Amino acid sequence: GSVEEIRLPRAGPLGLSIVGGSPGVFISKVLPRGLAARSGLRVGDRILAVNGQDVRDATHQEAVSALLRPELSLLVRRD
Amino acid sequence: HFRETEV
């Protein structure tokens, strides 16, 4: 139905947890106060890309590394 | 069971 761009204005910690990686990488937790929650990311979001980096079939660690690059634009899909 | 990483 839709793909969405969720952009986080980083200060640093994002305030989210991910599961999955090499059947896709998914947001498993969003700290209520954290930057991710404030920016509109939601549990169940599947991360497709990070700042243009395709992470659809990324490793778990690869996804972590992409998220910790030095705004953080996340392309996500919800199933 | 499913590794979860805080970021």
PDB file of C-alpha atoms in Angstrom:
ATOM      1  CA  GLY A   1       0.000   0.000   0.000  1.00  0.00           C
ATOM      2  CA  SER A   2       2.716   2.482   0.827  1.00  0.00           C
ATOM      3  CA  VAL A   3       6.395   3.105   1.389  1.00  0.00           C
ATOM      4  CA  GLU A   4       7.326   5.886   3.732  1.00  0.00           C
ATOM      5  CA  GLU A   5      10.304   8.131   4.398  1.00  0.00           C
ATOM      6  CA  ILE A   6      10.917   8.714   8.096  1.00  0.00           C
ATOM      7  CA  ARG A   7      13.608  11.367   8.747  1.00  0.00           C
ATOM      8  CA  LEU A   8      15.285  11.740  12.124  1.00  0.00           C
ATOM      9  CA  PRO A   9      17.024  15.015  12.986  1.00  0.00           C
ATOM     10  CA  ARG A  10      20.039  13.565  14.802  1.00  0.00           C
ATOM     11  CA  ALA A  11      21.682  15.342  17.724  1.00  0.00           C
ATOM     12  CA  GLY A  12      24.057  10.089  18.671  1.00  0.00           C
ATOM     13  CA  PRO A  13      21.347   7.781  20.011  1.00  0.00           C
ATOM     14  CA  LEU A  14      18.298   7.150  17.867  1.00  0.00           C
ATOM     15  CA  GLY A  15      16.023   5.538  20.395  1.00  0.00           C
ATOM     16  CA  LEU A  16      15.018   2.453  18.403  1.00  0.00           C
ATOM     17  CA  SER A  17      15.817  -1.259  18.309  1.00  0.00           C
ATOM     18  CA  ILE A  18      15.880  -3.486  15.275  1.00  0.00           C
ATOM     19  CA  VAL A  19      15.340  -7.179  14.704  1.00  0.00           C
ATOM     20  CA  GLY A  20      16.015  -9.362  11.706  1.00  0.00           C
ATOM     21  CA  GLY A  21      18.425  -9.296   8.816  1.00  0.00           C
ATOM     22  CA  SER A  22      20.517 -11.763   6.829  1.00  0.00           C
ATOM     23  CA  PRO A  23      13.894 -11.943   5.925  1.00  0.00           C
ATOM     24  CA  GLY A  24      14.318  -8.142   6.239  1.00  0.00           C
ATOM     25  CA  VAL A  25      15.170  -5.664   9.045  1.00  0.00           C
ATOM     26  CA  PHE A  26      12.316  -4.508  11.260  1.00  0.00           C
ATOM     27  CA  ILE A  27      11.834  -1.927  13.996  1.00  0.00           C
ATOM     28  CA  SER A  28      11.175  -3.962  17.124  1.00  0.00           C
ATOM     29  CA  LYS A  29      11.162  -1.137  19.675  1.00  0.00           C
ATOM     30  CA  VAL A  30      10.885   2.631  19.833  1.00  0.00           C
ATOM     31  CA  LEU A  31      11.806   4.317  23.110  1.00  0.00           C
ATOM     32  CA  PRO A  32       8.775   6.530  23.811  1.00  0.00           C
ATOM     33  CA  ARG A  33      10.774   9.754  24.374  1.00  0.00           C
ATOM     34  CA  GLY A  34      13.518   9.050  21.873  1.00  0.00           C
ATOM     35  CA  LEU A  35      14.358  10.655  18.597  1.00  0.00           C
ATOM     36  CA  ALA A  36      12.904   7.802  16.561  1.00  0.00           C
ATOM     37  CA  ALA A  37       9.518   7.986  18.250  1.00  0.00           C
ATOM     38  CA  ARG A  38       9.439  11.788  17.961  1.00  0.00           C
ATOM     39  CA  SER A  39      10.251  11.476  14.237  1.00  0.00           C
ATOM     40  CA  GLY A  40       7.397   9.024  13.622  1.00  0.00           C
ATOM     41  CA  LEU A  41       9.116   5.683  13.369  1.00  0.00           C
ATOM     42  CA  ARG A  42       6.971   2.822  14.537  1.00  0.00           C
ATOM     43  CA  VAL A  43       7.416  -0.752  15.669  1.00  0.00           C
ATOM     44  CA  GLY A  44       6.809  -3.107  12.780  1.00  0.00           C
ATOM     45  CA  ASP A  45       8.369  -0.741  10.258  1.00  0.00           C
ATOM     46  CA  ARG A  46      10.552  -2.673   7.848  1.00  0.00           C
ATOM     47  CA  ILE A  47      13.690  -0.693   7.039  1.00  0.00           C
ATOM     48  CA  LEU A  48      14.304  -0.613   3.285  1.00  0.00           C
ATOM     49  CA  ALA A  49      17.007   2.051   3.032  1.00  0.00           C
ATOM     50  CA  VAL A  50      19.090   4.342   5.225  1.00  0.00           C
ATOM     51  CA  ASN A  51      20.235   7.666   3.685  1.00  0.00           C
ATOM     52  CA  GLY A  52      20.026   6.030   0.273  1.00  0.00           C
ATOM     53  CA  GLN A  53      21.756   2.814   1.368  1.00  0.00           C
ATOM     54  CA  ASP A  54      19.594  -0.188   0.467  1.00  0.00           C
ATOM     55  CA  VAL A  55      19.260  -2.448   3.513  1.00  0.00           C
ATOM     56  CA  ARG A  56      16.352  -4.620   2.321  1.00  0.00           C
ATOM     57  CA  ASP A  57      18.537  -7.747   2.315  1.00  0.00           C
ATOM     58  CA  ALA A  58      21.146  -6.410   4.726  1.00  0.00           C
ATOM     59  CA  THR A  59      22.793  -8.298   7.544  1.00  0.00           C
ATOM     60  CA  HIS A  60      21.710  -7.433  11.052  1.00  0.00           C
ATOM     61  CA  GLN A  61      25.131  -5.894  11.728  1.00  0.00           C
ATOM     62  CA  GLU A  62      25.106  -4.229   8.323  1.00  0.00           C
ATOM     63  CA  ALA A  63      21.807  -2.610   9.272  1.00  0.00           C
ATOM     64  CA  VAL A  64      23.186  -1.493  12.632  1.00  0.00           C
ATOM     65  CA  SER A  65      26.212   0.015  10.891  1.00  0.00           C
ATOM     66  CA  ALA A  66      24.045   1.838   8.390  1.00  0.00           C
ATOM     67  CA  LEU A  67      21.968   3.312  11.219  1.00  0.00           C
ATOM     68  CA  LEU A  68      25.093   4.506  13.040  1.00  0.00           C
ATOM     69  CA  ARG A  69      26.588   6.497  10.130  1.00  0.00           C
ATOM     70  CA  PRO A  70      28.263   9.728  11.402  1.00  0.00           C
ATOM     71  CA  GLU A  71      19.440  13.829   8.999  1.00  0.00           C
ATOM     72  CA  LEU A  72      18.896  10.054   9.104  1.00  0.00           C
ATOM     73  CA  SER A  73      16.417   9.285   6.288  1.00  0.00           C
ATOM     74  CA  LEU A  74      14.824   5.853   6.668  1.00  0.00           C
ATOM     75  CA  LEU A  75      12.730   4.366   3.875  1.00  0.00           C
ATOM     76  CA  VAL A  76      10.330   1.932   5.484  1.00  0.00           C
ATOM     77  CA  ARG A  77       7.477  -0.359   4.555  1.00  0.00           C
ATOM     78  CA  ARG A  78       4.735  -1.705   6.817  1.00  0.00           C
ATOM     79  CA  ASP A  79       3.436  -5.181   5.936  1.00  0.00           C
TER      80      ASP A  79
ATOM     81  CA  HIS B   1      15.759 -16.096  19.802  1.00  0.00           C
ATOM     82  CA  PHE B   2      15.638 -12.963  17.606  1.00  0.00           C
ATOM     83  CA  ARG B   3      18.653 -10.710  18.211  1.00  0.00           C
ATOM     84  CA  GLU B   4      17.523  -7.142  18.953  1.00  0.00           C
ATOM     85  CA  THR B   5      19.925  -4.197  18.923  1.00  0.00           C
ATOM     86  CA  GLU B   6      19.442  -0.830  20.616  1.00  0.00           C
ATOM     87  CA  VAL B   7      20.528   2.119  18.467  1.00  0.00           C
TER      88      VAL B   7
END
